[PDB]
A paper describes a structure:
We successfully determined the crystal structure of the apo form at 1.93 Å resolution. The asymmetric unit contained two FhCaBP4 molecules forming a homodimer with a two-fold axis. Each FhCaBP4 monomer consists of an N-terminal calmodulin-like domain (residues 4–90) connected via a 10-residue flexible hinge to a C-terminal dynein light chain (DLC)-like domain (residues 101–190). The α1 to α4 helices form classical EF-hand motifs, where two helix–loop–helix structures are connected by two short antiparallel β-sheets (β1 and β2) that flank the Ca2+-binding loops. The DLC-like domain adopts a compact β-sandwich fold composed of antiparallel β-strands (β3, β5, β6, β4) capped by an α6/α7 helical hairpin.Sequence conservation analysis revealed that the EF-hand motifs are genetically conserved, whereas the flexible linker region is not, suggesting that this region may confer species-specific flexibility and functional diversity. Five residues (W163 to S167) of each protomer in the extended loop interact with five residues (Q’154 to V’157) of the neighboring protomer in the β4-strand through a pair of hydrogen bonds. Superposition with the FhCaBP2 DLC-like domain model (5XF0) yielded an RMSD of 1.45 Å over 88 Cα atoms in PyMOL and 1.0 Å with a Z-score of 16.1 for 87 Cα atoms in DALI, highlighting strong conservation within the FhCaBP family. However, a key deviation was found in the flexible loop between β4 and β5 (residues Phe166 to Phe171), which displayed significant conformational variability despite the conserved sequence. The elevated number of interactions in FhCaBP4, particularly those involving Glu12 and Glu78 located in helices α1 and α5, respectively, indicates that the calmodulin-like domain contributes to stabilizing the flexible loop within the DLC-like domain. The calmodulin-like domain exhibited an RMSD of 3.5 Å (79 Cα atoms, DALI Z-score 7.6), whereas the DLC-like domain remained structurally stable (RMSD 0.5 Å, 90 Cα atoms, DALI Z-score 20.0).
Numbering used by the authors:
A (entry chain B), B (entry chain A): 4 to 190
């Protein structure tokens, strides 16, 4: 069923769907064909394929794929399973009063981030002077548990945003009057 | 005139001010002296200064400095020129109605960015259905003319932010009811 995100994220999702835990190896041609059948630009995919060092059989290991794209293989193993989980029917609710605006995160990670924001907010009382502390605590949690470096914002009122982030690392949500925007970038 | 920004940004500004020869050569002892005069902490300066492969003649070239620090050499050449203009009393005024909240951008880039936001906004009518297009135009302009990748936000209301940006590449400003946040992250 449906597949979502930027072109690079869709290629990564398709690689993870073809990948099998037993060997973590994906056929280059099968990856290209799946990208074609999901309408990705031909030039872009061919340019990505040239970045991957395939073996003599034309197979890309998950490690080589992540290395070439600046991804963390251990993290992509977890993403693979957390996405399979929801496709298999084992989805979870979001925590109470969480409204997701947009996201590229796996569902488990969405629960993790929104529950930590609610926990940090509950300890400070949610006044504007306490919001700097909440933002710093949420950024610290994200930087440590999910790698550096995270852009972290809380705002009230209306907003419009065009932004760039590492694959699957972005989430925009609302709890009451607070809008929370988090995403990861390199370094 | 006064240094601004992070310790790393201040050390880079000092490097560019010291670089006053045709070969882009800076004397490492002179750089340390400037950092000491500007009360930059020794622990951080020493960590950065060890990232450079000084020639054993105690000299660092702009190119070596930029490579060790993850800066684009051509951008730093232009940054030096723009900052010196301001030091010389020859900077541009900010355009009408622009209130700068925080920035480590050079003055000429601050003028260009806030000017471009006003022009993109003036060609739409300023309505909320049109602001997604304003933000997209600004981000695309910045990505192309000043390198990838730019984060771009327009907001009405209040905000709290912890974020990370490349040296000199961040600007927050207000024009009328709109607060505009822009900054660049790697890649």
């Amino acid at each position: 069923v449906a597949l979502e995100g930027s072109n690079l994220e869709k290629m990564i999702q398709l690689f993870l769907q073809l990948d099998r835990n037993r060997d973590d190896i994906v056929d280059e041609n099968e990856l290209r064909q799946a990208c074609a059948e999901h309408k990705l630009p031909e030039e872009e995919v061919s340019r990505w394929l040239d970045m991957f060092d395939a073996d003599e059989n034309g197979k890309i290991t998950l490690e080589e794929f992540c290395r070439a794209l600046g991804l963390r293989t251990a993290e992509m193993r977890v993403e693979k399973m957390e996405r399979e989980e929801v496709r298999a029917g084992r989805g979870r609710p979001m925590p109470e009063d969480v409204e997701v605006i947009a996201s590229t995160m796996s569902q488990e990670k969405k629960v993790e981030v929104t529950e930590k924001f609610k926990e940090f907010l509950a300890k400070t009382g949610g006044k504007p002077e306490d919001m700097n502390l909440v933002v710093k605590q949420l950024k610290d949690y994200l930087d440590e548990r999910h790698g550096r470096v995270w852009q972290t914002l809380v705002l009230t009122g209306s907003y419009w945003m065009k932004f760039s982030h590492e694959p699957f690392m972005s989430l925009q949500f609302k709890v009451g009057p607070n809008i929370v925007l988090v995403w990861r970038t390199p370094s």
